[PDB]
Design a protein around this ligand. Structure first.
Ligand SMILES: CN1CCCN(C)C(=O)COc2cc(ccc2OCC(=O)NC2CCCC2)Nc2ncnc3[nH]cc(c23)C1
Ligand code: NA
Ligand SMILES: [Zn+2]
Length: 341
């Protein structure tokens, strides 16, 4: 064990105990906030500030949540993507805070902490879990433990909670800007931006700031800051080296039904001729269209569009829905679409 922790930004070498990442008070305040086949996500408090902790078992031979554990080599591309996107908050020509911030990454060894099992149980009793109770791991088990800034609540879970379609406009504008900046900087495609992967949190900032190819602009917040998550299918590049998930031989991804989400996977494959290493930023437009579609058809707002000014916003979002598929990229949308003028 002769690697440094957290990409060289932690002085420990080799695996660390859970207690390195979750000292007793941080551990005691963990509450589970979500899950997937990968493992578990908890919210806790560090220095009076909420954070999210995502815990993924790696390198072992046996099944977790019905699937084999990834190796570190298998997970590394997504760690790289997460970090590159987070680093856009501190860049100059192409700058955005719209991707989830990555605080730290550790490789942890040990059995699962009993205090996290308690939090897992509470979630299972209240919301119900699709996962195995993570109490079967042995003292040799390795995990990747990622600490993200806390991003809030997902858009699907906020289906009935947003003020108005003005809020929807801000959300769409924030998403479009973040995707554009990542296109410009990293030739980035998200490739899986369903409404579970858009987070919303309160902000006291009235305007949010971004920079696209050296040009800075602002977006009225409507009191919310958007964060994009989930890079399972994402693609980007740096100095000509491409990191992407190769789904060219996957079958089931393209046979979904019952939501426009599942059409987007098929429409992506059409656009790229099943060649997933290429750059097709139209996929970002496809996802933004799916999101706009959710805003207009599945979201319900606390205040409807009662005045002609608000009815006009609604009409303009309907016009965005009808016209946006004729743009080539999130960059094209941001720079050219009337909605964002
Ligand atoms: C609980 N959480 C939904 C859980 C289920 N779900 C949809 C995911 O997991 C999607 O992916 C991410 C989720 C979060 C953060 C980063 C993710 O992606 C990058 C990544 O993990 N890279 C890793 C690099 C190596 C492998 C993956 N989750 C959150 N982060 C911050 N605040 C939050 N509030 C609400 C949530 C949340 C939603
Ligand atoms: Na962020
Ligand atoms: Zn550390």
């Amino acid at each position: 064990n002769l690697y440094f922790q957290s990409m060289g930004e932690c002085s420990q070498k080799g695996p660390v105990p859970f207690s390195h990442c979750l000292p007793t008070e941080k551990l005691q305040r963990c509450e589970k906030i979500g899950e997937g086949v990968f493992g578990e996500v908890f919210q806790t408090i560090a220095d009076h500030t909420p954070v999210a902790i995502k815990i993924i078992a790696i390198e072992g031979p046996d099944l977790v949540n019905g699937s084999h554990q990834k190796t570190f080599e298998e997970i590394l591309p997504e760690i790289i993507i997460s970090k590159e996107l987070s680093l856009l908050s501190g860049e100059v020509c192409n700058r955005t805070e719209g991707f989830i911030g990555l605080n730290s990454v550790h490789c942890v060894q040990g059995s699962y902490p009993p205090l996290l099992l308690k939090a897992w149980d509470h979630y299972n009793s209240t919301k119900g879990s699709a996962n195995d109770r993570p109490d079967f791991f042995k003292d040799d088990q390795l995990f990747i433990v990622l600490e993200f800034e806390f991003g809030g609540i997902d858009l699907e879970q906020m289906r009935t909670k947003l003020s108005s379609l003005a809020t929807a406009k801000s959300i769409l504008h924030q998403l479009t800007a973040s995707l554009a900046v990542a296109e410009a900087s990293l030739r980035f495609e998200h490739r899986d931006l369903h409404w579970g992967n858009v987070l919303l949190k309160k902000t006291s900032l009235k305007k949010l700031h971004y920079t696209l190819n050296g040009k800075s602009s602002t977006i009225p917040s409507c009191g919310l800051q958007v964060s994009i998550i989930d890079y399972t299918l994402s693609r980007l590049e740096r100095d000509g080296i491409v990191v992407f998930c190769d789904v060219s031989m996957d079958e089931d991804l393209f046979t979904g039904d019952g939501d426009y989400q599942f059409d987007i996977y098929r429409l992506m494959k059409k656009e790229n001729n099943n060649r997933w290493g290429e750059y097709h930023p139209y996929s970002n437009v496809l996802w933004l269209h799916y999101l706009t579609d959710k805003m207009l058809k599945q979201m319900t707002f606390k205040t409807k569009c009662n005045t002609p000014a608000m009815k006009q916003i609604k009409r303009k979002i309907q016009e965005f829905h009808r016209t946006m598929l004729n743009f080539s990229s999130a960059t094209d949308l941001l720079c050219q679409h009337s909605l964002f003028k």
